[PDB]
Design a protein around this nucleic acid. Structure first.
Ligand SMILES: [Zn+2]
Ligand SMILES: [Zn+2]
Length: 922
DNA sequence: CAAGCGCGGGTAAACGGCGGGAGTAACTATGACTCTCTTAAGG
DNA sequence: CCTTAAGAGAGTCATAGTTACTCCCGCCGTTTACCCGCGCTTG
RNA sequence: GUAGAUCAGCUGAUCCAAUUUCGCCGGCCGGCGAUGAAA
C-alpha cells in the first residue's frame, strides 16, 4: 500500500520506500533531511572564538559582558541568552583567562654569447619587420605540431575542436591585457600578520656538479629568444657555470633572454570564453635552466609548511586528494559536521604586488642579494601575447609571478605560508584525533572547518590576508560544501541555500548530485563517485582527427590513458565498468587498424617488448596503480596522510585493488612484486595466433618497429605490418574459425597444393609465392650487404663455388683483417625454436670442411680456421634470433639500427608475397 | 529616593547525539549449468 | 593411414553477496527560554 | 570538380593518401624563417 510521492511506485514496507527515495530521488529527500536548529550543540570552535573575543574585549576595556558580545559578534548566530548561559560554564571562563594571560604579554664565452645574442636580435628584428581545404589545413597543422611538442598536438586532438584558441587576439587582449597591465595597490602585510608568520643561505657561487645534478627535460619549447634546446645543449658545462657565475655576481641577465611569449591554455574541456584561459608565460631556455637550479636550492634549503603539499604535486595530489576523500567519507559514516571550502587561486598568480612580495621575501630570512635580484627581474617584465601566429603589442607586466618560471611556484609558496599561518590555530577537522585544516594545493585551496562560525572566520581570515597581499578571491569557481547531520534521526544532509559570504558576494553551495572537480577529479557532496564516460567522445575526436593509424595508437597509448586513469584511481569504479571501457577501447583500436574480431585480447594489452601493442588495459592497470599509490600511505611522513590511511574506505579500496591485481597478474621472480606485463605476456604466448610470437621477449629490437621507429612507416604499410604480425591475413583456415561444415575444399589450398590452406603454407611453400620469396631474399641480403660496405668489408654475394659434395650456395662472403664473413640469410617459420634452426644452418656450413676450404681458397684467407660461418635468421613474423643477434652484434661488427630495420624488411617481404599470391589468385 | 532598565546567578523542559535492533532497493562480485574450438599413439 | 575420446574457453543469465542506506525505541547529556534579583540611571 | 582515388547527387561525404598560411633570399622553379603549451 506504500507508494512513492515522486515516482508512484509501490513498495511492501516504508523502509524500502525510504531507501527508494534515497537512491532514486536525492534532492527532495535531501530537503526533507534538513535538521532543526532549535538547540544546536556548542562545538569547540565556537567556544574558542567566544573566549578569545572576551579576552580581547576585556583586555581593552576591563569589563564586558554578553550585551557587548552580541555587538562584537554579529554573525555568531547565538542569542543574548545563549551567550549568557554558555558564559557561566567553568572551562570557558578558565579558557578566557588563558587567552587573557597570553594576550597580556672568459673572452671566448663573451664572444659566443655575443654571437647568440646577435642572432636572437636579428631574429627579433626580422619578426618585427571549403570543408575539404579546411581539413587539409588541419592536417598540416596537426602534423607540424605532433612531430614537435607532442603533448600539444595530443591535448589539441583529445579536445579536438580546431583547438587553436580561436577566441583570437581580439576577445583575448581586451580581457587579459588590462588585467596584466594594472599595477596592484596592495598595502602589504600588516605587522601582526608578520608576527604570526614568525611562528639558510641561498646566494653562493654555482657548482658544476650541481649543474649536472640538476635534471632538465630538454623536450622544451624555445622562447621568443629563438634559443632552442639544441644550441643550449651545445653549451658545455664549464661554460654554463662561468656564465651562471657571471650573472650570479652581476645580478642581471641580458635583456633579450628575459622576454616572454604569453600563450593561453584552457582549464575546462570546453572553453566558454576568455575567462577560462591561463596566461602561461614562456621565457628563454637559458633563463629557465638557470632558474631551475635556484628553484631546487630554495626548495631544499627552505621546506614549505607541513600543511602545504601543493608545489610538490608531481606526486603530491595523491595525498591531498586521498585525505579529502577520507575526511568526506568519515564525516558521512560518523555523521559529524564538516564544512569544506574549495577556493580558487587561478588568476591569483598574476595579482601579487611586487611591493608586497619584496618585503615578504626580505623578512622571511632570504638574503638581500636574492631579494634584490627578484625585485629587479619582476620590475622589468615585458611580455608579448601570441595566439595562432598573431602577436600583441608589447605589454608591461605589473603584477609579476609568471606561471611558467621555475621560481614562480616556490616564490608563491611563501605567500601561501603567510596565508596558511593567518588562519586561526584551533579550527579544523579532528580526523582520527589528528587536526587537519587546509590541504593547500598550489592552485586550489581548500579550507576545512567543524562549524559554520569557524568556517566563516577562516573565510574572513583568508580574505583579509589576500586583500593585504592584493590577491583577489574570485567568487565564480569557489564553492562551499556543508555536511550537517540530523541528530536524533541519524540522517546526513547538506545545506542548499548560500550561507557563507567571502567578504560579501555570497558563495555557491554545492549539493547532493551536483558534480564538481578539485583538480580534475570527479566529486560530489557524497564524495568521489564515478567518471562521466567521456572516453567515447575522446575516442571519436581521435578517430575524426587527421592522424595516421600509428599516431592514433600512440596518442591513445601515452596521453589519454594517464589523463583519465588519474581520475579513475582517485575514483571508485567497479571492475565491470572497467571491462566495458576496455572493450570499447579495443573495438576502437580495431576500427582504426582494420583488425578482425578473432584477434586475441592479449595482443592489444601485451607490452611492446613481448610483442603486443601496449594499450594499457584499464581493468588490470588500475588496480595496480591503486595498490602502488596507496601502499605508501601508511609510511607517509605527513601525519595527516597516515591518519587518513586508517579510514575504512581507503582500506577497503586497497583490499579490493589487491584482490584484482592478484587475479590479474603474476609474481615476478626477481623483485617478488606483482606485474601485469607478465600476465599479458603469458596470455599472448598461449593462443594459436600468438604461439609463433615467442622469441620476441629475448630479442629487444625485434619489436622496435611498433613504437620507437613507427615514424617512417606509412599508414598503409603499418596497418599491413600489424596485419601480418598477428597473422590477420584472411586465409581459408583463418576464415574457418567458426565455419567448418563446408567441404574440405573450403579448407584446402586455393592454388591446388592439396594441403591444409594455412597462412604459413601460403607464404612459404605455395608454388606461386616462391617468386615473391626470392624477391624478399635478395632484398634482405642486399640490405645487410650494404652494412658490410659501410663497415669496411670486401663483400661478394653468392660465391660461385663448386665443392666436391655439390653446389652449396653461400649468401655473401667478405674479409677484413681475417675473420670469416660467411653469412647466410634465412627467413623461417616460427613453429620451431629459432636457435635450433640457426644451429642447423650454421653446422651445415662450418662443419662441412670441404666448403670451408673452398671458401678459404676463394677468399684467399691464409688459415682455414680463420673463417667463421654464421646465419642471420628471422621468422616471417619478424622476430630476431638471439644467437644471431649476438653474432652480428659482436663478430661481424654492426650498429643496432641496422639490425633494427631487418624486421621491417622481413615483414614487408612477407606481405608483398601475400599480395602477389592474392593478385595471381586468378 | 522610588521605579525602570541593563547586568548577571538559578531552574527546568524540550533538543540531540548515540546505542540497540530489525531490515531492504539496488547494484555487483561470483558458482555453476549450457554452447564452441582442439594435439596424438596404440595395438 | 584416416580418425576420436577426451580436453579447455565463453554465454546471457540465475543466484548469492554486498553496499548504502532505512525507521523505531529508548536513554542521558546538553542548551537556552524564563525567573529573580543587584547596581546604575532617570524623574 | 578534387593534391589522388573512391561512394554519391558542378556540390557533398570516406580513405590505406592528405605540409595549410605568411614573410624572406633568390631565380611559373630552388632554399631559409615564422606558422613551435606550461614546470
Ligand atoms: Zn519514487
Ligand atoms: Zn598452396
Amino acid at each position: 500500500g506504500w507508494t512513492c510521492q515522486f515516482c508512484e511506485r509501490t513498495f511492501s514496507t516504508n523502509r524500502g520506500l525510504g531507501v527508494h527515495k534515497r537512491r532514486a530521488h536525492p534532492v527532495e529527500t535531501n530537503t526533507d533531511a534538513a535538521p532543526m536548529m532549535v538547540k544546536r550543540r556548542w562545538h569547540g570552535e565556537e567556544i574558542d572564538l567566544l573566549a578569545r573575543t572576551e579576552a580581547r574585549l576585556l583586555a581593552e576595556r576591563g569589563q564586558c559582558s554578553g550585551g557587548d558580545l552580541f555587538g562584537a559578534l554579529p554573525g555568531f548566530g547565538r542569542t543574548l541568552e545563549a551567550i549568557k548561559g554558555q558564559r557561566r560554564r567553568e572551562p570557558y571562563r578558565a579558557l578566557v583567562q588563558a587567552h587573557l594571560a597570553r594576550f597580556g604579554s672568459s673572452p671566448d664565452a663573451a664572444r659566443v654569447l655575443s654571437e647568440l645574442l646577435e642572432g636572437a636580435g636579428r631574429r627579433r628584428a626580422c619578426r618585427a619587420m571549403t570543408s575539404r581545404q579546411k581539413r587539409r589545413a588541419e592536417y598540416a597543422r596537426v602534423q607540424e605540431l605532433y612531430k614537435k611538442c607532442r603533448s600539444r598536438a595530443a591535448a589539441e586532438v583529445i579536445d579536438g575542436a580546431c583547438g587553436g584558441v580561436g577566441h583570437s587576439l581580439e576577445e583575448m587582449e581586451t580581457y587579459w591585457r588590462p588585467i596584466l597591465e594594472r599595477v596592484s595597490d596592495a598595502p602589504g602585510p600588516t605587522p601582526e600578520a608578520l608576527h604570526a608568520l614568525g611562528r639558510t643561505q641561498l646566494w653562493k657561487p654555482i657548482s658544476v656538479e650541481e649543474i649536472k645534478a640538476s635534471r632538465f627535460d630538454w623536450r622544451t619549447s624555445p622562447g621568443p629568444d629563438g634559443i632552442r634546446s639544441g644550441q643550449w645543449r651545445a653549451v658545455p658545462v664549464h661554460l654554463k657555470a662561468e656564465m651562471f657565475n657571471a650573472w650570479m655576481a652581476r645580478g642581471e641577465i641580458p635583456e633579450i633572454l628575459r622576454q616572454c611569449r604569453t600563450v593561453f591554455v584552457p582549464k575546462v574541456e570546453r572553453p566558454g570564453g576568455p575567462g577560462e584561459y591561463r596566461p602561461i608565460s614562456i621565457a628563454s631556455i637559458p633563463l629557465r635552466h638557470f632558474h631551475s637550479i635556484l628553484a631546487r636550492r630554495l626548495l631544499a634549503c627552505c621546506p614549505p609548511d607541513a600543511r602545504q603539499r601543493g608545489f610538490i604535486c608531481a606526486d603530491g595530489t595523491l595525498e591531498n586528494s586521498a585525505v579529502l576523500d577520507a575526511v568526506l567519507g568519515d564525516s558521512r559514516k560518523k555523521l559529524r559536521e564538516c564544512h569544506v571550502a574549495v577556493l580558487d587561486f587561478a588568476k591569483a598568480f598574476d595579482t601579487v604586488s611586487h611591493e608586497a612580495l619584496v618585503e615578504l621575501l626580505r623578512l622571511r630570512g632570504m638574503p638581500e642579494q636574492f631579494c634584490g635580484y627578484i625585485a629587479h627581474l619582476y620590475d622589468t617584465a615585458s611580455t608579448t601575447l601570441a595566439v595562432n601566429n598573431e602577436m600583441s603589442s608589447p605589454v608591461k607586466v605589473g603584477r609579476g609571478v609568471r606561471q611558467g618560471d621555475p621560481l614562480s611556484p616556490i616564490l608563491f609558496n611563501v605567500v601561501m605560508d603567510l596565508i596558511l599561518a593567518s588562519l586561526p590555530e584551533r579550527v579544523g577537522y579532528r580526523l582520527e584525533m589528528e587536526l587537519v585544516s587546509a590541504l593547500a594545493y598550489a592552485y586550489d585551496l581548500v579550507l576545512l572547518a567543524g562549524s559554520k562560525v569557524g568556517m566563516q572566520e577562516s573565510i574572513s581570515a583568508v580574505d583579509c590576508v589576500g586583500r593585504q597581499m592584493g590577491l583577489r578571491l574570485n567568487c565564480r569557481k569557489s564553492a562551499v560544501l556543508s555536511m550537517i547531520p540530523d541528530g536524533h534521526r541519524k540522517k546526513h544532509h547538506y545545506l542548499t541555500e548560500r550561507t557563507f559570504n567571502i567578504g560579501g558576494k555570497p558563495l555557491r553551495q554545492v549539493s547532493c548530485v551536483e558534480r564538481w572537480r578539485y583538480l580534475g577529479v570527479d566529486f560530489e557532496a557524497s564524495g568521489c563517485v564515478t567518471l562521466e564516460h567521456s572516453i567515447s567522445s575522446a575516442l571519436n575526436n581521435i578517430s575524426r582527427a587527421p592522424l595516421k593509424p600509428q599516431q592514433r595508437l600512440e596518442i591513445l597509448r601515452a596521453h589519454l590513458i594517464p589523463r583519465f586513469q588519474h581520475g579513475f584511481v582517485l575514483g571508485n569504479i567497479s571492475d565491470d565498468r572497467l571491462r566495458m571501457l576496455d572493450v570499447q577501447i579495443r573495438k576502437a583500436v580495431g576500427q582504426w587498424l582494420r583488425l578482425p574480431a578473432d584477434v586475441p585480447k592479449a595482443y592489444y594489452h601485451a607490452a611492446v617488448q613481448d610483442g603486443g601493442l601496449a594499450i594499457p588495459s584499464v581493468r588490470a592497470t588500475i588496480p595496480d596503480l591503486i595498490v602502488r599509490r596507496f601502499g605508501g600511505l601508511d609510511s607517509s611522513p605527513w601525519s595527516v596522510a597516515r591518519a587518513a590511511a586508517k579510514s575504512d574506505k581507503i582500506r577497503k579500496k586497497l583490499r579490493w585493488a589487491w584482490k584484482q591485481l592478484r587475479r590479474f597478474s603474476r609474481v615476478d621472480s626477481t623483485t617478488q612484486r606483482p606485474s601485469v606485463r607478465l600476465f599479458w605476456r603469458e596470455h599472448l604466448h598461449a593462443s594459436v595466433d600468438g604461439r609463433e610470437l615467442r622469441e620476441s621477449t629475448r630479442t629487444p629490437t625485434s619489436t622496435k618497429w611498433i613504437r620507437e621507429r613507427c615514424a617512417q612507416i606509412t599508414g598503409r604499410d603499418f596497418v599491413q605490418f600489424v596485419h601480418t604480425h598477428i597473422n590477420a591475413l584472411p586465409s581459408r583456415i583463418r576464415g574457418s574459425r567458426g565455419r567448418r561444415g563446408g567441404g574440405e575444399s573450403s579448407l584446402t589450398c586455393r592454388a591446388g597444393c592439396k594441403v591444409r590452406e594455412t597462412t604459413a603454407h601460403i607464404l612459404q611453400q605455395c608454388h606461386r609465392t616462391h617468386g615473391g620469396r626470392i624477391l624478399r631474399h635478395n632484398k634482405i641480403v642486399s640490405f645487410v650487404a650494404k652494412a658490410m660496405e659501410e663497415n669496411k668489408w670486401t663483400v661478394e654475394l653468392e660465391p660461385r663455388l663448386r665443392t666436391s659434395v655439390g653446389l652449396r650456395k653461400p649468401a655473401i662472403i667478405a674479409s677484413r683483417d681475417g675473420v670469416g664473413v660467411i653469412v647466410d640469410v634465412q627467413v623461417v617459420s616460427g613453429q620451431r625454436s629459432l636457435d635450433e634452426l640457426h644451429r642447423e644452418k650454421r653446422n651445415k656450413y662450418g662443419n662441412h670442411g670441404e666448403l670451408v676450404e673452398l671458401v678459404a681458397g676463394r677468399l684467399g684467407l691464409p688459415k682455414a680456421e680463420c673463417v667463421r660461418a654464421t646465419s642471420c635468421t628471422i621468422s616471417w613474423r619478424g622476430v630476431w634470433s638471439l644467437t644471431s643477434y649476438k653474432e652480428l652484434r659482436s663478430i661481424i661488427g654492426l650498429r643496432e639500427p641496422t639490425l633494427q630495420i631487418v624486421p621491417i624488411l622481413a615483414l614487408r617481404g612477407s606481405h608483398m608475397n601475400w599480395t602477389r599470391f592474392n593478385q595471381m589468385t586468378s
